[PDB]
């Protein structure tokens, strides 16, 4: 797995996929953005932390992305 990535570690991808398997790419982003819009406080705190640390405008993007990934 839930926090673990999927079971694609075996390197056995092929040209056979279902319609509930290719929907993850957009489903993950949709759920993430829904929770992001429903949660303003954590987003504001993470923005404050990203401006506090780094002071480079290149690492704070990684900070906010990783916080929005540990969170939904």
């Amino acid at each position: 797995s839930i926090m673990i990535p999927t079971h694609s570690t075996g390197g056995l991808h092929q040209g056979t996929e279902g319609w509930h398997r290719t929907n993850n790419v957009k489903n993950f982003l949709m759920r993430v953005e829904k929770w992001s819009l429903r949660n303003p406080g954590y987003t504001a705190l993470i923005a404050i932390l990203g401006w506090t640390l780094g002071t480079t405008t290149a690492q704070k993007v990684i900070f906010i992305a990783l916080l929005l990934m540990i969170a939904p």
């Binding site: 990535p5 079971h7 570690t9 040209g15 398997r21 790419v25 993950f28 990684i62």
Partner: protein, 499 residues
């Protein structure tokens, strides 16, 4: 069998010097072998299937807690010990409630509890193990050029010895195809497959099977047992007890976890299971071997050329690759004869393009004859005949050579560049090229590529973006040592390939 309808097709030009070419087969792919002076052939592998399975460990999914019991102890230090503790089929755990004067004890403190509940399961993930000396992979080989009646099937094709089949068992790795008068073809391929046996299991859950890893199957937290006789030994992973208020508890399960399992292990390779034989179709492995065309000879070469006129059936149509297909028929009596086929740029001119079929002999009075032709990019005319009554159908094949090169390179880097070291096994190249390529890719797959795993597409794209930004903002010129590790090919693999 016939390799016309498939789009993932490989064309091998053959070897002029030797009589062998190394091919690598996929369950959906097909290759065409065409030497010089020999009839061209098509080889395709049908399926791989194991026969005998060994049980490993059947887990549990849904609990059926049926019977309950309880026993209480006063704050006097002699605690309660349920009698059913000495039965293996009962899950029992002891708690410490808050007993007082209302319960009828006579001393304020904490007591003891012991609630044993009988366990029963309904859904089990019966695992299995595959032996590396039981898979029987089959293949087929066919020869282009032979002509038969309009109404015939694979039975007649095999009867005329033109569709010889193969059974490359784990024991007999050397097989010969009779192929009738055309000679004989032999195969020399190994036990090296894409799947890695003795390292994976099969996870039968509800009729849906998989090929999940042994260690990951071992690390599942669920009540397991022994396949010989089912009685569970890790009972506590699916039964939780409620709050023990006084001299009583309640038993609650955790559901079925079938959805959780099908979501966690929902992207592993999905094998099938054909009953009445306990066979499983792998639909994932490869097969890499080398066809020795030493006894392969043309069937019709002393025949006289066909003289009279043909009749067109199933008018020429294009293919996904771009090679036309036509099915002429013969109705006259000067048979057997060999059909003269040519592809000119203009009527009665030089021959241009490439001819796919080898030597369309006829053998009989009324026979259909599938003819495959690869015309050039420009306008061209396909002439099937000898005299003045010849078939003069023409074609356009609108396309660009630069586009063809782009598609060829993309197909190579997409399909061929996979398979690790197996990428450079489409043929034989001198100058030590293939040898050092395989030698370097051996250690390349030994370390940092296949020594460990754990990459799914989400982590792949995340790490790819991170590495992109790091390389853009890179000092000390680390891109010089980063181009070899992650460049354009691996980034394409992360982005679009391997999907």
């Amino acid at each position: 069998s016939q390799c016309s309808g498939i789009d993932k097709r490989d064309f091998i030009q053959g070897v002029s010097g030797g009589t062998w070419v190394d091919v690598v087969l996929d369950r959906k792919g097909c290759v065409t072998i065409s030497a010089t002076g020999k009839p061209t052939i098509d080889v395709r592998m049908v399926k791989m299937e194991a026969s005998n399975l060994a049980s490993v460990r059947t887990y549990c999914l849904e609990a059926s807690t049926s019977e309950i019991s309880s026993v209480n102890g006063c704050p006097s230090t002699t605690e309660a010990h349920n009698d059913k503790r000495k039965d293996s089929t009962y899950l029992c755990e002891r708690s410490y409630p808050d007993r007082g004067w209302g319960n009828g004890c006579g001393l304020f403190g904490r007591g003891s509890l012991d609630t044993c509940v009988k366990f029963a399961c309904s859904k089990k993930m019966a695992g299995h193990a595959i032996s590396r000396e039981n898979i029987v992979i089959t293949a087929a080989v066919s020869v282009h050029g032979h002509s038969g009646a309009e109404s015939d099937d694979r039975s007649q094709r095999k009867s005329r010895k033109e569709l010889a089949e193969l059974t490359i068992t784990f024991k007999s790795s050397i097989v010969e195809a009779d192929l009738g008068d055309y000679g004989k073809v032999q195969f020399e391929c190994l036990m090296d497959f894409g799947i890695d046996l003795d390292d994976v299991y099969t996870a039968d859950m509800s009729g849906k099977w998989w090929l999940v890893k042994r260690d990951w199957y071992h690390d599942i937290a669920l009540p397991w047992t022994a396949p010989s006789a089912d009685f569970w030994h890790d009972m506590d992973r699916l039964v939780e007890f409620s709050t023990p208020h006084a001299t009583k508890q309640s038993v609650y399960t955790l559901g079925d976890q079938e959805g959780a399992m099908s979501t966690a292990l929902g992207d592993a390779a999905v094998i099938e299971y054909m009953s009445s034989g306990s066979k499983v179709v792998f639909r994932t492995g490869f097969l890499k071997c080398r066809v020795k065309m030493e006894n392969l000879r043309l069937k019709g070469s002393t025949y006289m050329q066909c003289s009279k006129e043909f009749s067109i059936l199933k008018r020429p149509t294009a293919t996904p690759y771009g090679t036309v297909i036509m099915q002429v028929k013969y109705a006259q009596t000067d048979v057997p004869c060999r059909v003269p086929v040519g592809v000119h740029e203009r009527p009665g001119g030089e021959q241009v393009g490439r001819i796919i079929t080898a030597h369309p002999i006829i053998l009989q009075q009324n026979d259909a004859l599938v003819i495959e032709v690869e015309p050039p990019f420009g306008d061209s005319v396909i002439e099937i005949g000898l005299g003045t009554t010849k078939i003069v159908e023409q074609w356009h094949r609108d396309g660009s050579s630069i586009g063809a090169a782009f598609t060829s390179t993309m197909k190579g880097v997409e399909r061929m560049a996979l398979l690790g070291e197996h990428a450079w096994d489409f043929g034989s190249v001198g100058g030590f090229f293939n040898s050092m390529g395989k030698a370097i890719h051996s250690v390349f797959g030994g370390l940092f590529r296949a020594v460990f795993g754990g990459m799914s597409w989400i982590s792949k794209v995340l790490i790819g973006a991170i590495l992109m930004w790091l390389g853009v903002s890179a000092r000390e010129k680390t891109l010089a040592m980063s181009l070899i590790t992650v460049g354009a090919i691996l980034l394409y693999l992360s982005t679009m390939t391997n999907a």
